[PDB]
Amino acid sequence: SRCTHLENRDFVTGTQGTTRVTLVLELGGCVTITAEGKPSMDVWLDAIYQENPAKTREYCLHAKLSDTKVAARCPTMGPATLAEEHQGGTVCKRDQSDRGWGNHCGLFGKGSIVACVKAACEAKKKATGHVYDANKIVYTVKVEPHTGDYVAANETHSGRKTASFTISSEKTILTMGEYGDVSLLCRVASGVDLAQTVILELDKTVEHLPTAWQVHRDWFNDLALPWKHEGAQNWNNAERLVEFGAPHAVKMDVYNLGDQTGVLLKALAGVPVAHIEGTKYHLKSGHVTCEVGLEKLKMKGLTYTMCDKTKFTWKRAPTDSGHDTVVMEVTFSGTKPCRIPVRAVAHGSPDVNVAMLITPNPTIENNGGGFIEMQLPPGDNIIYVGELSHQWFQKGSSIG
Amino acid sequence: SRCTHLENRDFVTGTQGTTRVTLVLELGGCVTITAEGKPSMDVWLDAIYQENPAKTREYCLHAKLSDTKVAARCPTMGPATLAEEHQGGTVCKRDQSDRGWGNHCGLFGKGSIVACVKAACEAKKKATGHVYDANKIVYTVKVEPHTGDYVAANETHSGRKTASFTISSEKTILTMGEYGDVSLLCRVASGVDLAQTVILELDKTVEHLPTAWQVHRDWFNDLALPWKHEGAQNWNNAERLVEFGAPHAVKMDVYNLGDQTGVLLKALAGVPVAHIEGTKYHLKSGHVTCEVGLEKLKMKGLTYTMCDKTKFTWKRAPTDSGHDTVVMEVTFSGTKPCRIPVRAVAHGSPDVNVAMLITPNPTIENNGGGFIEMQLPPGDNIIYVGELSHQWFQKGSSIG
Amino acid sequence: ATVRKERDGSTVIRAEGKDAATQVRVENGTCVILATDMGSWCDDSLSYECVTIDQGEEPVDVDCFCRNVDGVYLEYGRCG
Amino acid sequence: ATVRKERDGSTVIRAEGKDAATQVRVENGTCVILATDMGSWCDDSLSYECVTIDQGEEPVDVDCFCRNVDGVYLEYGRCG
The missing domain is CATH 2.60.40.350 (Immunoglobulin-like)
Structure with a gap:
């Protein structure tokens, strides 16, 4: 049985009279319920997920810089402008440059210099997020008779039953075939504000990386990268991936600050790696509390003959x-x-x-x-x- | 004059008798020497460079991972091997996985698991170095009469003379045309172990970055990246850009740790950006000490008529x-x-x-x-x- | 999915995205490939055992398992 | 090097690697391009003034300078 194989396996052995059993089911663990005159059932939390969660902001891991312009004015000739300063698709820097006769100024002194660049994002170099909603999460609890009976003909798990709950719909009765019925009343306990839990993915490139990570929204919103909401024309805080060079008389170079993939992945070391199965975004850790009702569970094969001792x-x-x-x-x-x-x-x-x-x-x-x-x-x-x-x-x- | 334009301009005004003048010439600065009965000369340190310096080790900014193999043994069945462990072109990880009947083991317990991957470098994703040698550095000192006379016909600097020195050859006499001769005895003072100074470059990609940086060899050798000497078959410390996943029964995924360009460039913020002019690798900062000899300097146009006062x-x-x-x-x-x-x-x-x-x-x-x-x-x-x-x-x- | 009997006794199934959730017959046996992250064949690959599950046993923590055939290995690329 | 008189009075020289250390005649004037990091035309570009140096003056801290022609601008790409 799948349950026999798990490091986190707990036992609940009811008494002759017990009909209700309270349990905490953690993701990745299982519980084997044994009750006298009843069969044994393997109960487990199979998943806490949300389908199509609301997208958060997206971040830029690698800026694509272009159309760099430098404007300069002479000492006492007022300030240098570029329209690109009151624009959102750009990063600008105001500085002063040393000026004189040999660079078209009648005066020797510091003169105004402005450099502007057009900041966008590279193809496939975004980190995207999705946030959870307690009102929309679903949690799947599985029940299977602990008999070790598998249909290795059609590779199907015999007697396995799945109960799906939501915050509203948190009661169910599963029919275990010829074993009767088991009732479940499950309350999800996230402990973490689901509205403060973000699942982070990175746009696929050639390197092989984890699917996603489960991060706190606090942290995710504090990433030192340009960001925007899907649909926005330009990146906000585009200046985070740009470095301006020392100004020369009328020229000032604009440099890139590199691909931030390494930076981000260093931060994500020791962060739980989460799974996505199509439209289903999965919480890597969580637990649920069930009241398991065994009263309607019947023992299978009671009137069967006793097996020959020598066979x-x-x-x-x-x-x-x-x-x-x-x-x-x-x-x-x-x-x-x-x-x-x-x-x-x-x-x-x-x-x-x-x-x-x-x-x-x-x-x-x-x-x-x-x-x-x-x-x-x-x-x-x-x-x-x-x-x-x-x-x-x-x-x-x-x-x- | 170029010298009149500089923020770091120093004056040396000799006396009627002075013939030797001691000076410190810094890169990026200039000195205007004035001596009575002699013309004024603009002396400056134009460059400290080495041509074709010895290459240091090269580092990998982005690892190219491939041919991942996982080997596993059952509990009490001894250890799992892959030949790739005693090989240099690979990264390996020994771990234990949970095993049982449903994954071909007669025993339930931890079994040996080994995963190996082939680590190389991506195209154009190396950081290379070159180290200096006091025995091979050259330092260029320029002398030009402070007259503000330019040949704006053929765009040539009139009267400009260049003296090249080495640790051995550190004396020179420059002929300033019709102004006579100026002698220079220049001693280079690096203050920094040139054999402990590295110039760092990154392989060109699409983004625009500084040319190079001047770093201390101490620091450069402490970079947490895989490295090798040009010519070597494999990368040393290739495990620095690899992350192994949680082992499953017989499978264990191997991930990349991303492009380290951002990481390195964060470290290089506030590091002096250095220049390379072909085979010439330039020290961004330094100074030299000269004894400037003016005895053989003659005044030009002494027997000329005096200009008409009204013209x-x-x-x-x-x-x-x-x-x-x-x-x-x-x-x-x-x-x-x-x-x-x-x-x-x-x-x-x-x-x-x-x-x-x-x-x-x-x-x-x-x-x-x-x-x-x-x-x-x-x-x-x-x-x-x-x-x-x-x-x-x-x-x-x-x-x- | 291609099947090859590498001279060192061993057998290797090379699968793709199309081969996910399918049955492949190897020798007298059959193997089931459940690996979700599969792609086109390339250098970015992963190779591991495809476990022989004893007749009438539920596979556990394996995404590639065989029945009636021993020493099967799985390899897939992650491109496209 | 191509020269164009952008309708807003202004003039723009678009140079390449081949145009480094060369003289270009603009209107009645001439401009000298000394920019070392030049390449093929693209998005990764830099545009700045090409200073008019008064007759018989040494240019200082400029890698693009003009004589007898005002309001000249330099643009180059850094590709190839």
């Missing part, structure tokens, strides 16, 4: 699950369907079953079936799947 | 030179060649000449001539070029 084989012998439980898979040569006779005993006590089953009524189906998961006390145990045995030593405490 | 016109009337001296140009309608009758008087003293001439024997040539420069006491003066007068008020002290 078992080890498909996968007892191994540590990585969560202080033992996992295994059996192959049953006999006639299907049927209930597996599984138990475990601690050395010295043949008559006492010590197996606290995570898969409560293991059955061999005419399709899948055969996976058993159990919690065993520390020490030397023997695991029995009918007459089929295997010794297991259980490590003390937890290595977590 | 003068103001070409350019007395104006402040910007160095507490008064400059002017006259047009002489009469017959050439001749010596100009120039003097100045302070109000109340018609009989006393107060003009301390910076151009000691002004003459009207059959080509050029007519420029006068003088130092006048503070207050109300009258300047006379023959019968041609002009009032001049002289500012007190100095505004320097």
Whole structure:
């Protein structure tokens, strides 16, 4: 099962009477719910996303400079102008230059000098943003029976059910097929102002980079780059990527400040890299709180025959699950369907079953079936799947 | 004169007997030497340069990444290898990935994962260096009579003479034509270890940038970029422009860290921008110390007739030179060649000449001539070029 | 998707964007390619194992997996 | 080098790398272009005055200067 493989796997084992269970589901983790007389379900937060979020401002990583003009006046001849100063598509610098007879001035002294350049952006050199809205986010919670039954014929996950919630629609009932019904009441807890969360992307170039990053809107708005709203004619703060040279008598050179990709990516080291799946923009981190209702969950294959004790084989012998439980898979040569006779005993006590089953009524189906998961006390145990045995030593405490 | 126009202009006015004068000539400045019974000379440090300096190491501003391979082993199956680890043209990362049954491992636990990528450099994305050698530097000192005589026919500077020195050859005698000879003994003082001075250039791309920068070798060698010596097969420290992604079961993505041009140019803000004129690499700042010998300097046009007092016109009337001296140009309608009758008087003293001439024997040539420069006491003066007068008020002290 | 049996026993599937979410038959086995960031073939490439999943097992944390065929490798370019 | 008399009285010389260290005649006057960083015509350009130097004066801190012609401007691209 997908859940058995995760580092962040939590267990919730209800009592004979428990019908409501409160859970925090984090992105990238899972929870295995076990309830007596009920099957085990794997519940997990699959995604927190918004489709088509509002675009923020866009930034310029590399300025395209052009049509540089320099105007100069002589000492006491007033100031030098260029119309480009009261224009938005430009960057300008007023300075003074040393003037004299050998550069057409009747006076030796400082004279006015102005240089202007036309600032735009290079093709594919923008950093774009999208901001979230709590009113528009969607969060997907998945439920699947913990049986380890996969349809490796059409590569389909059997019994997997998806519940989609919004801030308004935050209640659901999922029908787990022949296992009955599970109710979920999930409240999203962002902890972070979604309206203050930005997803940042960079226009694709030849180099291979992460998809996007999840940044705080505070920070994103403080980037020292020219910016604009998609549709705007010119870039605001275009002067951030320009450097003016020392003025000569009537000439003053205008230089570029380089490609800021490296600068930005240095800042983004240690920032969580986020995913985009078409129109779906994903929050890299978050969690949700559910009240899981198990009352309508029924045990599958109760009236099935018990599997013949001698028809078992080890498909996968007892191994540590990585969560202080033992996992295994059996192959049953006999006639299907049927209930597996599984138990475990601690050395010295043949008559006492010590197996606290995570898969409560293991059955061999005419399709899948055969996976058993159990919690065993520390020490030397023997695991029995009918007459089929295997010794297991259980490590003390937890290595977590 | 070029010298009259400079902010950093110094005066050296010798006495009747002085024949040797010690001077510090800085790049970008000039010195006007005045000696009694001798003409005035404009001496200046024109350049400190080295032709074809030894190349330093070259750095990579943008890495070209390719042929990414990922190798993985299962828990307890030992380590994952790729030959690319003991190779120089690559960057590698050893990590551990979460493994289990659903990714071909019989055990659940961390398994070895290695990712390797081939690191090279993008076309035109290198920063190159050249270092200096005191044994190979050349320094050019220019001498020109301070007369303001230009051949605006063939656009040639009349009387300008260039002396080239090296650490060995540091003595010279320049023949100033009809003005005699000036001897120079110049000792270069770098103050900075030339062998610890680097000139940095960036490979030309579409953006307009400064030519080069003069940096300290200490700093240049500490740049956090991959580097190599021209000719080397691979880049050293190629790992400086690579970022490995979170390892998945058997896959681990390798990303680029962007174009470092912006990063480098941010560091170079406030660094002196240096010039390269073909094979000539120029030190942006420096100075030299000369012992200037004036003994063999003769006064031109001593036996010339005195210009007719009434044949003068103001070409350019007395104006402040910007160095507490008064400059002017006259047009002489009469017959050439001749010596100009120039003097100045302070109000109340018609009989006393107060003009301390910076151009000691002004003459009207059959080509050029007519420029006068003088130092006048503070207050109300009258300047006379023959019968041609002009009032001049002289500012007190100095505004320097 | 092209399949080649590189002389060192090994096998290599070279896939593109068109090959995403498809089944490819290799030898007696079959491999499923789920890799989303695929493009045209070039230098900007990524090569890794296409895991053999034991019959009737759910693949986990893999975007390329095989059944009934061992030692399969995936390579794709990220251009276009 | 091309010379054009832009209707607003003004005149503009558009020069290239080939035009470096050359004399160009504009109207009754002549201009000398000394600009070292010149290239082919493009967007990456620089435009500034080409100073009228009074007859028999040494030009100082100018890389473009005129004689006997006023209001001359220099433009060049930095491509190739």
